[PDB]
């Protein structure tokens, strides 16, 4: 039944409150998703001033229900199956040789809009490390998100490594460990092992003076 809510274009709202090494900030995002094509278009704004971390470090925190699941994999789409009541998504993002983010989000429908509400806490970042030193390029590599079922929580786990390009040609690794659990009492789809193939393009709105990020993303399920 939840997949029925995604056959057309769906408006998206994202609201994040963050604290990284005591630097407090908020981000508001608006856009739309079209799961038929695994396509997301979003604009995020830092509503509190300057973002204290690089925008690319927030991309995985800032709605995998818009993935394109091929018809032959439709029985493996947990994310849509949990809608409209939604799911809780928790992650730990470990930056190699640096600090970590812990996030908690609720993703659910509010009327006909898909909403992602997030709290992010970052600790033990190095002041002149790649994150607080803002040494990351404004770009995003393509990645696979590996999904496995968590039968005991009636949900799923996801594991992946993000490779963030550093301005000097090196790479900043970020290990991601995520868990999702449904909010409602109805049944959800528990998938076989598979992955999400993601591609993301970051840009700016040339008329915008606030600190912001324009994102175009494609997400396709595969491996089955
Ligand atoms: Mg390079």
Ligand 1 centroid to Cα of residue 34, in Å, is 31
Give which of 21, 2, 15 is closest to 126, Cα–Cα.
Answer: 21
Ligand 1 centroid to Cα of residue 117, in Å, is 33
Per-residue exposure over 74-88, b if at least 16 CB sit within 10 Å of its own CB, e if not: eebbbbbbbbbebbb
Cβ contact 56:140 at 8 Å: yes
Q: Hey, which residues does 187 pair with through a beta bridge?
A: none
Angstrom distance (rounded) from CA 85 to CA 67: 18
Ligand 1 centroid to Cα of residue 124, in Å, is 26
Ligand 1 centroid to Cα of residue 191, in Å, is 36
Structural determination approach = X-ray
Ligand 1 centroid to Cα of residue 140, in Å, is 11
Structure tokens at 106: 């609720």
Ligand 1 centroid to Cα of residue 171, in Å, is 9
Give the architecture-level CATH label for domain 1-224.
Beta Barrel (2.40)
Ligand 1 centroid to Cα of residue 167, in Å, is 7
Give which of 219, 192, 176 is closest to 73, Cα–Cα.
Answer: 192
**Quoted resolution (Å):** 1.5
Ligand 1 centroid to Cα of residue 105, in Å, is 32
Pairing of strands 194-203, 39-46: unpaired
CA geometry: angle 106, 89, 2, nearest 5 deg: 70
Ligand 1 centroid to Cα of residue 147, in Å, is 29
Angstrom distance (rounded) from CA 208 to CA 201: 18
What are the residue boundaries of the structural domains of the chain, listed by start? Answer: 1-224
């Amino acid at each position: 039944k939840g997949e029925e809510l995604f056959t057309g274009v769906v408006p998206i709202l994202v609201e994040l409150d963050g604290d990284v090494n005591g630097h407090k900030f908020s981000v508001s995002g608006e856009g739309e998703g079209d799961a038929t094509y695994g396509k997301l278009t979003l604009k995020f704004i830092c509503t509190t001033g300057k973002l204290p971390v690089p925008w690319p470090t927030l991309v995985t925190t800032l709605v995998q229900c818009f993935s394109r699941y091929p018809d032959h994999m439709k029985q493996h789409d947990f994310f849509k199956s949990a809608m409209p009541e939604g799911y809780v998504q928790e992650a730990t993002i470990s930056f190699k040789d640096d600090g970590n983010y812990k996030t908690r989000a609720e993703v659910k429908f509010e009327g006909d809009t898909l909403v992602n509400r997030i709290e992010l806490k970052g600790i033990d970042f190095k002041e002149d490390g790649n994150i607080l030193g803002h040494k990351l390029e404004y770009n995003y590599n393509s990645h696979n998100v590996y999904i496995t079922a968590d039968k005991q929580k009636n949900g799923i786990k996801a594991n992946f490594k993000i490779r963030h390009n550093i301005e000097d040609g090196s790479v900043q690794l970020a290990d991601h460990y995520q868990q999702n659990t449904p909010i409602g009492d109805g049944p959800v789809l528990l998938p076989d092992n598979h992955y999400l193939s993601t591609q993301s393009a970051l840009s700016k709105d040339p008329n915008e003076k606030r600190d912001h990020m324009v994102l175009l993303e494609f997400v396709t399920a595969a491996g089955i």
